[PDB]
Amino acid sequence: ATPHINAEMGDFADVVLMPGDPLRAKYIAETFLEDAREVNNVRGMLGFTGTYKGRKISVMGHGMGIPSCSIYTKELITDFGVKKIIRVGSCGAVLPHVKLRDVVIGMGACTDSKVNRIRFKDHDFAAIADFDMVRNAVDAAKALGIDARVGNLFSADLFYSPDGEMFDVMEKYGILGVEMEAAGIYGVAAEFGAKALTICTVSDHIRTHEQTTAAERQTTFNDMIKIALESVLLGDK
Amino acid sequence: ATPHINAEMGDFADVVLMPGDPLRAKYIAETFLEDAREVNNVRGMLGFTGTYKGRKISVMGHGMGIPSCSIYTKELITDFGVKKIIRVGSCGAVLPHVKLRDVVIGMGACTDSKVNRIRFKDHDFAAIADFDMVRNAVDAAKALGIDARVGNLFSADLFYSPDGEMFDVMEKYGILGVEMEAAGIYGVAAEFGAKALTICTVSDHIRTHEQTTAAERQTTFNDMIKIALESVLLGDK
Amino acid sequence: ATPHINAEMGDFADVVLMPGDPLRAKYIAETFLEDAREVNNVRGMLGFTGTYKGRKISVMGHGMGIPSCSIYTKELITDFGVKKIIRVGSCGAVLPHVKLRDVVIGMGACTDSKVNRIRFKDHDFAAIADFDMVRNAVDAAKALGIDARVGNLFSADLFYSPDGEMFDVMEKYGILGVEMEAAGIYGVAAEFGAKALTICTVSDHIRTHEQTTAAERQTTFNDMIKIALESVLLGDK
Amino acid sequence: ATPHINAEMGDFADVVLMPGDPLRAKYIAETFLEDAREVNNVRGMLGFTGTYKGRKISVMGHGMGIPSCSIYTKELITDFGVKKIIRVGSCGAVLPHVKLRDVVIGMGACTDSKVNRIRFKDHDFAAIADFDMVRNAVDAAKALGIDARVGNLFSADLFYSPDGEMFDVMEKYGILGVEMEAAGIYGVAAEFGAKALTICTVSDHIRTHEQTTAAERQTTFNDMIKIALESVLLGDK
Amino acid sequence: ATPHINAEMGDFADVVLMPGDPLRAKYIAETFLEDAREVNNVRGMLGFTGTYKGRKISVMGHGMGIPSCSIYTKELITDFGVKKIIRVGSCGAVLPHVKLRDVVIGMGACTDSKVNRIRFKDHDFAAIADFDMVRNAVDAAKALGIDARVGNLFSADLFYSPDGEMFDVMEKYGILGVEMEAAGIYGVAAEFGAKALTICTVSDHIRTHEQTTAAERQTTFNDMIKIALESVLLGDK
Amino acid sequence: ATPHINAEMGDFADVVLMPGDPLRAKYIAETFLEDAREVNNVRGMLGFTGTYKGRKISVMGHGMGIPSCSIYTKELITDFGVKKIIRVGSCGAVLPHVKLRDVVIGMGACTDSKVNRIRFKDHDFAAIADFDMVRNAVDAAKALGIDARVGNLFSADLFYSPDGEMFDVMEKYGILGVEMEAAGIYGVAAEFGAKALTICTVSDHIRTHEQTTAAERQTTFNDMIKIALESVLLGDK
Ligand SMILES: Cc1ncnc2c1ncn2[C@H]1C[C@H](O)[C@@H](CO)O1
Ligand SMILES: Cc1ncnc2c1ncn2[C@H]1C[C@H](O)[C@@H](CO)O1
Ligand SMILES: Cc1ncnc2c1ncn2[C@H]1C[C@H](O)[C@@H](CO)O1
Ligand SMILES: Cc1ncnc2c1ncn2[C@H]1C[C@H](O)[C@@H](CO)O1
Ligand SMILES: Cc1ncnc2c1ncn2[C@H]1C[C@H](O)[C@@H](CO)O1
Ligand SMILES: Cc1ncnc2c1ncn2[C@H]1C[C@H](O)[C@@H](CO)O1
């Protein structure tokens, strides 16, 4: 057990799905996993382990922000034998052609955080996902007949940005979505030799904001989870 | 209600104590406040309001890391009329003469985050606490007979830092405790016009690795709470 | 005609292969393309346009370094309607398990250059390739019975760096190859909305000089061009 | 004797007041100290020692700018046993509600200098004053019946700044006064192990341009001196 | 032989002229040098060695950009005993009083590149030419009845910069011409203890396109080569 | 009159010699100027105006550090019509072949200050002297039969550097001397359109330190002044 996870080696599957909200982890466990058991509850960051179509899978929250998710993914990788981490969250869109409920896959993640410069001697470290994992996710999406865009995400340190000028910049350089952790997770994955992937559903449009129905948003969130779960099965083959 | 807090103006007191752990907030509400009511549970970030010696007080967790607590402190200030925020967290010590369960008051907070450089045109912003609040905390401690060092804290983005030599640099400059929020809260307090102070209890020693050996509080982590609550009363008079 | 390309709209195909060595441009047109015609000679940077299995394709060198290739790729995209750019070059390896003559595909590219920071408000822009282009290259190689590594490349501004320790850092973070263009090309593609990919052959193993024949080099080089050319057709399908 | 001070251990009191102007030091020695003796004149930086109500005290100018005062404060601490340094200077106001001759106490000091980044591995060092000294100054002011704001100062490298919009940024973050030494002195105090505090008298208003109109002191610049001297006595008790 | 130059010690003179356009190398050997012989062809970068009025001299292009010229100048200095490097190229002007076809000598070179910061601990290294070489060029021009401007050049990493405002800044600080090599060459010369100079002809006036004949261009170009060649002889005297 | 100079237009010559020490200005005035009168004494920074061989010349101190000398040179240029500034000071040497009493001329000046980045949009501004002034100084030196090296100086913000690693770096890149203001003065000269030059005599050897006789050091200091004064006369022709 670690300071943030009160569990023991074996308690987690070698693959962990991670939403930002801990309550969302219980929701995932309850909806898609069979014979699921709770394996952590320290600081309320609920974690579960069960099976998906006979495949052992875990799901646990990582909180908001790079500093927060950096702690959990690191401990899982170095103390619980986790080989793959899949973040499943939400994001805001800046590009006009990107609509609400769009499923985005971050093959890369930009950031205003300084954590990767600290690791990479003040230089530019391209925070990227594991290729095979992105490929498995894209294929799983196609099988479920779901679009899915693959590109850059932007991991912000400030949800409430002091100067909203970066949004024009993000849009200019093709950023698909704005969230708060992909760059941190990709950084730890590279630092401790593991594999990670971030998938998001567009929950708003920075400028436009727009709106839809709850039943439809909830349907789209489940598609994301199904894509994540099915991508793991393809990876096993 | 705000994007991360489902409450209305009036649900929170003008003063809020904030530990990083929502379960510590719950404990604080159950142990020190009377007629405590839960006012928030979104994303599991439990928030409570009650009274301490007739004084209306609130206590809510803020999660781990600057990006996380920046969201919560901001929403409380702009949408719930919160005038004062007192962080009651834990920290790691780097100085040889700093023992576990020691209480520190951060009049200042150093950091390796980029959030304040982003607010201050890439220059050095001295993230400092409110002077009167620091003074109230000092007097509250003396009256309670609890020792408490006043000085600089260091707000880290990476709990598992790649740069171990930076701790030597921290020690050389007299850093009293390493945590993950102070500089960020002080930045928000200044950006949105509110007052803040960070009080911490040494829970780990980065050198000796002696972690929170021997319980998790029982009295000291309670000491921190007594000082915070009593300092608030001095501020009212 | 542009400052560095004396040609008109239509002279270049929507897809262009670009070697670092300008002499390789004519070699490719002669060895792999049919009905090739010269389309540029300014500053001795010979450009050719022809067809590969009916598909229109162009080839022209970009010169060594980010500044140089940034010029050509930009002019090609904004003034000659180019939609995809494939850099075909060489790199040095820092990972012991990455062998000489290995074919690596850069899904991402790290760098010590300032160009992207100038474009991204001094933040971390993740310079990445176009996902489909990466997958096309991986599949084309497999079909050619060639094993290919997909990962991060490092684009150095200084071939003769005074910072020897940086090679240890690159290895620790899994950098597959060191070259001098990818990050610059990926920045341009993002800035002007185009697609790009860099494929490199391991020409040497930094800190471990090993020998290789001239017959082997041509063979590996021809393999890389075949991989790139076949990848374009898959991209069309 | 040190490279810039021709005196011997014992010539200075363990506490030294330092205005940027050597002529102000002379004035202070002649007006407030008894049996004042000149202990230095190298480069014209006049230094004096005498007593205030029986308490041994010294007063020496430090020149304009961080590089200048960094030299003098360092030499005093390492070669003359000086334990406390109180800067008594002038500053420019950016806030609309700050009037000429107002007294400010810098509990913290922001800066555009690079000296502290050079000491703190390019991270953010919160340049702060000694808490007890700040408190002594506050009490000394109350007892004397002099108003005094406690907060952040901004230590500028360029008195004639090219960046005028930075003043708006300073105002937004509540900077009480703009001067040129505080952050540097606090850095030295921390590096060489001593205590410091900066007290300033508003001499200019950067917005209204109303400079030190109406004399150069007569009583207020004397107020600053009374507070400094009296705060020292409180510290001894 | 070096990675980019297939020659041996002695093939190059101790002085080398370097145009950005590789095609100009053969033109110079044919038009100004006597008994020229080819000494390099790797990557199509033709190098020649001959004599001018008995003085041994070599000429070879460096390619566009700091990264490219840094390679060649370095190899020439460390492996071919070269002592002086004179870059002869073109530049764009931002000062209205600097006319088209003007000859400018860069005593210093500003830059937006990171190469020198990597060499100088992230501090400001002033990339300067060799004083005697500057004076030799000024005197040679005067003797040729040509007026020459000596001052600062700006070496840009991006010919197509997204930061349009930077040209206003360069003008305000007196930048005589904008090119893409000088600062890199000056860094190399300083790093390996050699002498260097950059001479450029104003080929265009940024933000003010003006016309010029092809006969005029050759004339000005020949003038620059004569200035450079005659400067070497003065340097010998 | 300005806040730092109590004089009026006409009081200073259009050429001003500036030592760091104000007492050294009186010394220069007394030793080389005829009919010299004091024109400033604010903050003890003595300034004088007299004539040298019929040429009107001024001499005034600038204090230690870039922030200090930046204030004076700026006011002289924009408020007193000064066209040329010549700093005449001392410096420490890092290069072995540079000896005590060597006369160094800084055609360029590196620095760890941030003032030029603030002016040059965070880029590299090569802080250089005016060419004609360097040329006049070199020629004046030759006429007086004095050696004089021309090259880079290093303007340090910290006389007492926290980490003496930069000295090896300075030595590696050929820095002739270490002082504390040239880069600041060259920056203001470029900002307000004036001309400046810095000349220094080596007063110590960072590592070696060495030693000589006072009579000889004083002779060398006078040679420097004579070189400065005579250089002005050549400039008039
Ligand atoms: C619009 C926007 N900006 C930043 N983060 C966003 C976002 N929309 C969603 N997120 C994500 C990432 C965080 O974990 C959380 C913040 O509410 O949801
Ligand atoms: C070593 C280290 N670094 C950063 N924060 C640390 C730490 N040891 C303890 N902490 C503290 C601060 C956080 O608020 C908390 C996170 O678990 O513990
Ligand atoms: C070992 C090494 N380092 C940097 N760039 C390298 C390299 N080996 C090959 N390259 C590539 C990229 C450049 O375009 C060129 C430099 O010789 O070949
Ligand atoms: C506008 C401005 N900037 C920086 N320092 C200023 C200022 N106006 C006044 N000062 C103060 C601080 C110094 O200690 C002193 C220098 O003359 O005046
Ligand atoms: C306008 C402009 N900008 C940048 N570099 C320029 C230029 N005009 C000429 N050059 C020079 C330097 C490069 O080597 C090449 C770029 O076309 O010519
Ligand atoms: C060794 C050394 N380092 C930094 N500055 C030096 C120096 N020797 C002389 N100086 C100069 C510049 C300052 O104005 C003053 C500092 O004593 O002398």
Domain boundaries, chain C: 1-237
Q: Which residues of E are annotated as a binding site for phosphate?
A: 20, 24, 43, 87-90
Question: CA F158 to CA F41: how far, in whole Å?
Answer: 27
Q: What are the chain F neighbours of E127 within 8 Å (beta carbons)?
A: 108, 124, 126
Q: Per the CB < 8 Å rule, is F111 touching E124?
A: yes
Question: CA E29 to CA A114: how far, in whole Å?
Answer: 51
Tokens of D43: 């480069």
Chains in contact with A, counting 3 or more C-beta pairs less than 8 Å apart as contact = B, C
The closest of F100, F87, F114, F94 to F28, measured between CA atoms, is F87
Interface test with F, best of E124, E135, E166, E188 (most F CBs within 10 A): E124
Q: What are the chain D neighbours of B123 within 8 Å (beta carbons)?
A: 110-112, 166
Which residue, by CA, sits nearest to atom 2 of ligand 3?
C92
Task: State the nearest Cα–Cα gap between E99 and chain C, in angstroms.
Answer: 20
CA-based max dimension of chain F: 49
Q: Which helix (H) or strand (E) segment is F150 a member of? A: strand F149-155
Q: Per the CB < 8 Å rule, is A125 touching C121?
A: no
- From B112, B160, B212, residue closest to A114, measured CB to CB: B112
F101-114 burial, b at 16+ Cβ within 10 Å, e below that, comes to bbbbbbbbbbbbbb
Closest atom, ligand 6, to C-alpha of D3: 17
Per the DSSP assignment, residues forming a β-bridge with B179 are: B155
The burial of F61, by beta-carbon neighbours within 10 Å (0-12 exposed, 13-18 middle, 19 or more buried), is given as buried
Q: Interior CA angle at B87 toward B86 and B88, to 5°?
A: 115
Closest atom, ligand 1, to C-alpha of B4: 17
Q: Per the CB < 8 Å rule, is B157 touching A114?
A: yes
Closest atom, ligand 6, to C-alpha of F159: 4
Per the DSSP assignment, residues forming a β-bridge with A30 are: none
3-state secondary structure (DSSP) of residue F119: helix
- The one-letter amino acid code at A75 reads E
Tokens of A9: 């080696």
Question: CA B172 to CA D193: how far, in whole Å?
Answer: 9
How far does the centroid of ligand 1 lie from the alpha carbon of residue B42, in Å? 14
Q: Per the CB < 8 Å rule, is D67 touching F68?
A: yes
Q: Per the CB < 8 Å rule, is C68 touching E71?
A: no
- From D121, D127, D174, residue closest to B169, measured CB to CB: D121
Per the DSSP assignment, residues forming a β-bridge with C221 are: none
The burial of A192, by beta-carbon neighbours within 10 Å (0-12 exposed, 13-18 middle, 19 or more buried), is given as middle
Tell me which method was used to determine the 3D structure: X-ray
Question: CA C10 to CA C58: how far, in whole Å?
Answer: 11
The closest of A152, A158, A154 to A64, measured between CA atoms, is A158
The closest of B172, B181, B150, B166 to B65, measured between CA atoms, is B181
Question: CA C23 to CA C45: how far, in whole Å?
Answer: 9
Q: Which residues of A are annotated as a binding site for phosphate?
A: 20, 24, 43, 87-90
- From A107, A110, A134, residue closest to C123, measured CB to CB: A110
Is residue E183 within 8 Å of residue E111, measured between CB atoms?
yes
Q: Which residue of F has its CA nearest to E154?
A: F125
Question: CA A110 to CA C125: how far, in whole Å?
Answer: 5
Question: CA A158 to CA E125: how far, in whole Å?
Answer: 34
Question: CA E210 to CA C200: how far, in whole Å?
Answer: 42
Question: CA D136 to CA D128: how far, in whole Å?
Answer: 15
- From C21, C64, C118, residue closest to E68, measured CB to CB: C64
* CATH architecture designation of domain F1-237: 3-Layer(aba) Sandwich (3.40)
C184: phi then psi, degrees, rounded to nearest 5: -70, -40
The burial of E56, by beta-carbon neighbours within 10 Å (0-12 exposed, 13-18 middle, 19 or more buried), is given as middle
Is residue D99 within 8 Å of residue D207, measured between CB atoms?
no
Pairing mode, if any, of strands C55-60 and C15-18?
parallel
Those residues whose C-beta lies under 8 Å from the C-beta of residue E139, and which sit 6 or more positions away, are: E231, E234
Q: What are the chain B neighbours of A61 within 8 Å (beta carbons)?
A: 44
Question: CA E156 to CA E169: how far, in whole Å?
Answer: 13
The closest of A177, A180, A183, A198 to A116, measured between CA atoms, is A183
In angstroms, how far is CA F204 from the centroid of its own chain? 17
Question: CA E138 to CA E234: how far, in whole Å?
Answer: 11
Q: Which residue of F has its CA nearest to E173?
A: F190
Tokens of F23: 């007492």
The closest of E177, E178, E198 to E187, measured between CA atoms, is E198
Q: Which residues of F are annotated as a binding site for phosphate?
A: 20, 24, 43, 87-90
- Half-sphere exposure at residue A191, Cβ-oriented, CA atoms within 13 angstroms: 25
Tokens of C232: 């374009």
DSSP string, chain D: -BTTB---TTSS-SEEEE-S-HHHHHHHHHHH-EEEEEEE-GGG--EEEEEETTEEEEEE---SSHHHHHHHHHHHHHHS---EEEEEEEEEE-STT--TT-EEEEEEEEES-SHHHHHTTTSB---B--HHHHHHHHHHHHHHT---EEEEEEE-S-SS-S-TTHHHHHHHTT--EEESSHHHHHHHHHHHT-EEEEEEEEEEETTT---S-S-S-TTHHHHHHHHHHHHHHHHH-
Is residue D85 within 8 Å of residue D76, measured between CB atoms?
yes
Q: Per the CB < 8 Å rule, is D107 touching B110?
A: no
Q: Which helix (H) or strand (E) segment is C87 a member of? A: strand C84-93
* Residue C187, ligand 3, Cβ within 6 A: no
Q: Which helix (H) or strand (E) segment is E50 a member of? A: strand E47-52
Q: What are the chain A neighbours of C128 within 8 Å (beta carbons)?
A: 107-108, 126, 128, 151-152
- The one-letter amino acid code at D205 reads H
Question: CA C2 to CA E159: how far, in whole Å?
Answer: 13
Proximal ligand: closest to the CA of E183: 5
- What resolution (Å)? 2.3
3-state secondary structure (DSSP) of residue A24: helix
Q: Is C204 annotated as a binding residue?
A: yes
In angstroms, how far is CA B140 from the centroid of its own chain? 16
Helices (H), chain F: 22-32, 66-79, 115-119, 131-143, 166-172, 182-191, 214-236
Q: Which residue of F has its CA nearest to E192?
A: F173
Question: CA C225 to CA D6: how far, in whole Å?
Answer: 75
Q: What are the chain F neighbours of E107 within 8 Å (beta carbons)?
A: 107-108, 128, 131
In angstroms, how far is CA B176 from the centroid of its own chain? 14
* D and C interact (at least 3 Cβ pairs within 8 A): no
Is residue F204 within 8 Å of residue F100, measured between CB atoms?
yes
- Please state, in angstroms and as integers, the Cα–Cα distance from residue F226 to each residue in D78, E110, F54, F220, following that order: 38, 32, 15, 10
The closest of E164, E157, E72, E70 to E112, measured between CA atoms, is E157
**Which residues of D are tagged catalytic?**
204
How far does the centroid of ligand 4 lie from the alpha carbon of residue D65, in Å? 9
Q: Per the CB < 8 Å rule, is B157 touching A115?
A: yes
